[PDB]
Structure formats: structure tokens, C-alpha cells
Structure 1
């Protein structure tokens, strides 16, 4: 029964943190769990309590005004919106620009480590395609662990439907060329399961997730927001609506610097009859004249500690914020762009009546003020958020899915 389990993620702390509860659930059941990424992530892994395995070298994706253009927009992965050439082009661009940059810097070293350590199971972040390659080379079972509304597997479904419509001579697959190429050098074939896993462990509540033909194991999202301590000032319950605003390095590197500044956001919120807590990086802190009387500025505060009894979370649609607000039943305001699943994170809540999404480009002082007022005053938002909270709470925990993962590993692995 006792397994070696290799977690693999691209070098994003935000992605890593989504994997920590499941990793610990498996370790707590007696399995050995190692987490592999590029050296830049080693320090972050080590502060999760989990054993880090540095692999390969660091990449230049972070250096490479905003990241929204039609070819990077996977927010509406629908047949009706994709000709063959459109979906093919999306796979070509995503493979060349994102997936290869994230993964090629470490894939061979990951295959090597897998050969040495011989994991029974590899659990991979959904864009960490180095993971299933390494698994397949050593015959390990492997599964995606999702932080995402599954635009990746859904766009792939669209892609395969269009591929099947093409004459044989015009059939082309950038994912098969890339991953099949690497697998070929180790004497292995490509299979579609290297793209979507042998199964999918999904932290997204079923009602908000795109329906797909996958072996799907739902698991409850449990907040992990990185290294955290409870400050003294949390004891003071607020006395009026508490509104939390997070801008990270994700926010800035992707939204750019072209839209409404955080300084204007603070000033708007500073005029309102609310308590404001703003988690800001040191550059956006300095670039800021006066701090309003109703506002506290922090470098970091643990969202899981802060969001109980909060009224609103304002953020860009990353899963840590989205999920932590969701489990606390806090309405969310998501001014964002069509990058990764961020727009879907916003629209899913918008359609459910649990929060508000707006395009970052349309954000003004008036929209900010009115949106916050609406999420505080209109009780239908809290009620819809509370239904989603309850849906998450009905989902089996990491603990509960451990035996399922054990059985699936026995079935699919060597």
C-alpha cells in the first residue's frame, strides 16, 4: 500500500499553495511525498512542511502592456467559437510561449529524478506537462490536480473535435509533437492521457466546473495561503463592513500598469463607511500619498484568518483568493482580464449572483464604489455565496479521497 508520490508544479508559489492540503493528506496516510519544481520555488516548498526536490534551471517566463490578446483567450472554449485554424493556433501559441517556457527548463531533470526515485504516482499542476512525461517514462500512475475552471481540458475537447473533421494530411497536434517528441527520446509513445491525466482531482465545486469526459475526483478546497501567523489586531471584530483588497505580483505582471491604479482604488474605498484591509507589495505601498483613516495596509495577512466576517474581497481571480473567499462565504469583486481562468472565475460567480466581475479596463471610481455598495447592501450576494460555501463543504475532503487515489493508482500504475 505504501507509495512514493511525486508532486510536480511550475515555479509559481500561487500554484504550489493549491496543492499543499492534498500533498499533506497523502503524507498523513503514511505515503512519502516529494514536491518537485525549479530551484526558484525551493524556499517556498520548504515552508509548506513538504520535502522539496529542485529540478533543472530557472526560466524567463516572468521577464517575458497586458497579457490579454485573442490568441491567449481561452475563456470561452466552445466549438461554435473555434474553427480548426483558431483552436490549432491557440495550442501552437500556448505550447510555444507558456508551456515550453514553464516546463522544458526542468523536464529532463524531472524524468531523471523519477527514474531514480520510482514514484508510484505523480500528481501534477494542470499546466505542468513535465509531470505526466516523467510519470509515463517510469510507468507511474498520474493525475492532474485542478485549481482551475477546466478551460484546458475543454479547449482540448474542442481541438480534438476539429482535428477529427480534417483530412488525414492536414492533421497536426502541437501538444503531441512537443510531448510526444520528448517521450520518443526515452522510447515512449504519446497518449492523450499525458494531456489530461489518467484522472482529474478537482478543487472546483461541480456546479461551477465545465462538464467534460474525464475520470473526475472532486475534492474540497482547503485554504493554504502560504506561511501565516495570526496578528493581535484580528481580535477586534470590525463594527462595519470589512472590505479586503489584494494586488500581488501576479496582478501587476499580468494586468500591467495601464488600468486604474491601486492608489486610486484605495482613495475611493477610503471615502466609504467601511473598514479596508489592503495587502500590497512594497512598490505600490510607497507610490501612495496619504493612507485613508478607514484603511490598514499590510505586506501580507493570511486570508483564511482575515476573511471570516469580511463583507467583500476585491482581487484579480487567482484561486487562493477565490477559494478562500468562497469557503468563507464572502462576496467577491473581480476586476480582471481574460488570462488563465481568471475571467471564468469572475463570470462563474457573476452568473450565480454571488459576486461581480468587470473587465479591468472598464474599472472606474464609480464602478468600484457602486460594486462594493451592492455586495454589502444587496443580501442576495451573501446568500448566493453561502450556497457555494455549502457546496464546497459537502465535497469530500483530501482525507476522504485518499483511498480513492490509492485504488486509482493500483488500477492505472505499474
Structure 2
């Protein structure tokens, strides 16, 4: 089991791709040849890590357009109730993307002959492609198990797809296609049923280490003041309305506020902001978090786990994806708090943030999880299992 060809495959967003990079880096360091399938935009990052990049997936727009046609036989959302529209994500993620990824990986697997596939949990198409070609596979988590309505709906679409592809799946949860599962969620905060799953292996949720520079103003800021970091992710985890509300609620505090708006959020008409607020487009989050006193965010898994890993209290605005499951876990740990979508006002943000900074129990809760995260097996230890997985 030396010099294996290992194919990693994730959905093409930062949140779905970054969590797999540490295991992939450890794999290469162990002497394996890493091919990494995800969005085309990650090619540069992947090459820098010494991986061979493969481009999979499609633009967000094309995904929802296909879902719209499939479900409602129309090209336009207009005239559709928000309830009807809420029927689309399960089709986008359980049917349309997996079909595309399954098809794209056919040629790749054929020519590469990988010894092992590492499939990111939400990238169902890659698991089907590996099943089809009979390649040993393991499933790599990105966050907490989420036994919620949306995931069950997505999984129903996946089973439907597998059946159409002539691939037999058991009834019931997809469960990583029954493969060994690499779980990066702090065990105490993981769903109890998932935590007891056979063939589950812990892996420390290492944040993505990028050699980028931190903003210069940080080096001369008055560190007697708290530093607050506000972000809404990279995948439409929030609206400009939410952002402005958060900025105005946080700007009041006696604190410095670093805002990272992300690539897919245009705030071009955001308005002027107080002097203690510094707007960045993108930052090396991993490198930043250890210097921060409060993380305010939409509740994405990467940022949730980064704040927990750094022992920093967090305030989230859970809205989409697994954000409610994260809020729940953070609440459980006493490591932060959240505001529901109806209760996001400068006043509500201000009060919550003041509380999270003043009450020492939140930092305590967060630091407890940081300790649990540090004791989890590191990529170099976990990577030693790959040969076994490929047998």
C-alpha cells in the first residue's frame, strides 16, 4: 500500500472543499499521489498543494435552472410560492449535481485507476461513481451529522438517481454509502446515533492553512480593545440587509470590527461604515481566528469549527444548510449563541455580542471544545489508515 493513487472529490465551494485539504496534504506527505476533484476555481490552490486538480460541478445558476425545469417545467421562479421554491434544493443537491459529478468522474476514474476515493459527504455523485467502478471509498464529513428534513429529502433524490443509474442502494439513510466515515466534528457535540456508527474514524478539524498575509492594520491596532470578526460565508449564507444590521449592532461596541464579505456577496451599495469597522473582501480566516475575541457569522460549518478550534465565542445567524445544527451544537457547549432570522436587528446583535464578550462562560465553553479538538487524531495519524481502507 505504498504510493497509492488517491482521488479526493468534493462539492465546489470553500466550505465543502477546505475540510478535506488537511487529509489530502497528509496523504501526499505520506508518499501518495493525490488527485483532487472539485470546482475549477480551486485549481491554483490545489496545484500549490502538489495535487492534480480535476474540475467538476456546475455554476450555481445552472443547478437551480435544471431543478426548476425538472420539478416545475418552467425556466423562471416567478409565480411560484416560497413553499414551491423550497422544493428545489433537494433536487439540486440530491439529483442535478450528483448526476453531473457522476458523469464527469466516469472518464477520470477510468483513466486514473485510483486505489481509493475520498468522497466529501455532500458530494453524492462521487460516491456513486466510485461504487459504479468498484473503487474502495471512504466518506469525509465536513460538519455535524444532520438528520433533518432537507437532508432526508436530498437522500431520497440520491436513491432515485442511483436507481436510474442501475446502482442498488439499501433502503434508509444514505449513510456515506455504508463506507468507513472520517468524522471531524467534536465527538461530544456530534449526534449520539452517528457517533456510535460502525467504521467511523475521528479526524481533527484542521482549518485550511494558507500562507496569505493578514490585513496590515491589525499589527497596529490597540489590542486593549476586543477584535470582532464578522463574516457570512462564501455561499449566500446571508443577505446585505443582515450584514448592515450586524455591522450597525457591532460598530457601537468599544471594539475593532473586521468584516470579510466574501466573493459571492456584492455589497457595493453598502454605505459608509464607522472608523472602527474595516471591510475586507477575503481574509486568511484560519490565520485570523486566533486573534479574535468574537466571531459573528451565518453558522457555516467551517467557521463554526474554526471558532471552536480557536476557543473563541461565536454568535451565529442560522438560516441555510447545516447552520441550525451548528447553532444547536454551539449552544450545547455553551460556546456561543444565535439569533433567529426574524430577530436580526442592530439592537439584538449589539446585546448578544455584549453578552458573549462580557460573560466569561462563553469563552470557557469555547475553550473546552478547543481542548477536545486538539486531542482528536491529526491528519498524519489518520492517513496511516488509508492503505487499510484501500484493501
TM-score under structure 2 length normalisation: 0.84
Contact 1:353 1:380 in 2 (8 A): yes
Question: Is 1:382 aligned with 2:366?
Answer: no
Counterparts of residues 176-195 of structure 1 (less than 5 Å) = 176-182=159-165, 184=166, 189-191=168-170, 195=175
> CA separation of 1:231/1:313 partners in 2, compared to 1, >3 Å: closer, same or farther?
same
Task: Give 1:353 deviation, angstroms.
Answer: 1.1
2:258 is paired with a residue whose SS is strand
User: What is residue 176 of structure 2 aligned with on the other side?
Assistant: 196
Task: Give 1:225 deviation, angstroms.
Answer: 6.5
Contact 2:226 2:292 in 1 (8 A): yes
Which shifted more, 289-298 or 271-280? 289-298
- CA deviations 1:140-188 (Å, max 9, x no partner) are 2111111121115x879989xxxxxxxxxxxx96433311322x2xxx5
Q: For residues 290 and 225 of structure 1, what CA distance do their matches in structure 2 show?
A: 32
User: What is residue 369 of structure 1 aligned with on the other side?
Assistant: 350
Task: Give 1:45 deviation, angstroms.
Answer: 3.7
Q: CA RMSD in A?
A: 3.1
Task: Give 1:326 deviation, angstroms.
Answer: 1.3
Counterparts of residues 240-389 of structure 1 (less than 5 Å) = 240-250=225-235, 253-256=236-239, 260-281=241-262, 284-337=266-319, 339-389=320-370
> CA separation of 1:255/1:234 partners in 2, compared to 1, >3 Å: closer, same or farther?
closer
- Structure 1: gaps (5+ residues): 74-89, 160-171
Task: Give 1:48 deviation, angstroms.
Answer: 4.7
- CA deviations 1:68-114 (Å, max 9, x no partner) are x88999xxxxxxxxxxxxxxxx9xx6652322222222312202211
Counterparts of residues 4-153 of structure 1 (less than 5 Å) = 4-39=5-40, 41-43=42-44, 45-46=46-47, 48-55=49-56, 58=59, 60-61=62-63, 95-151=90-146
Which shifted more, 283-292 or 112-121? 283-292
> CA separation of 1:8/1:399 partners in 2, compared to 1, >3 Å: closer, same or farther?
same
> CA separation of 1:131/1:276 partners in 2, compared to 1, >3 Å: closer, same or farther?
same
TM-score under structure 1 length normalisation: 0.79
1:288 is paired with a residue whose SS is coil
Question: Is 1:403 aligned with 2:384?
Answer: yes
> CA separation of 1:331/1:104 partners in 2, compared to 1, >3 Å: closer, same or farther?
same
- CA deviations 1:188-238 (Å, max 9, x no partner) are 543579751411101101011112234210000111166622344333462
Task: Give 1:291 deviation, angstroms.
Answer: 2.3
1:104 is paired with a residue whose SS is helix
Which shifted more, 97-106 or 280-289? 280-289
Greater than 4 Å deviation, 4+ residue runs: 55-59, 62-65, 69-73, 154-159, 191-195, 281-285
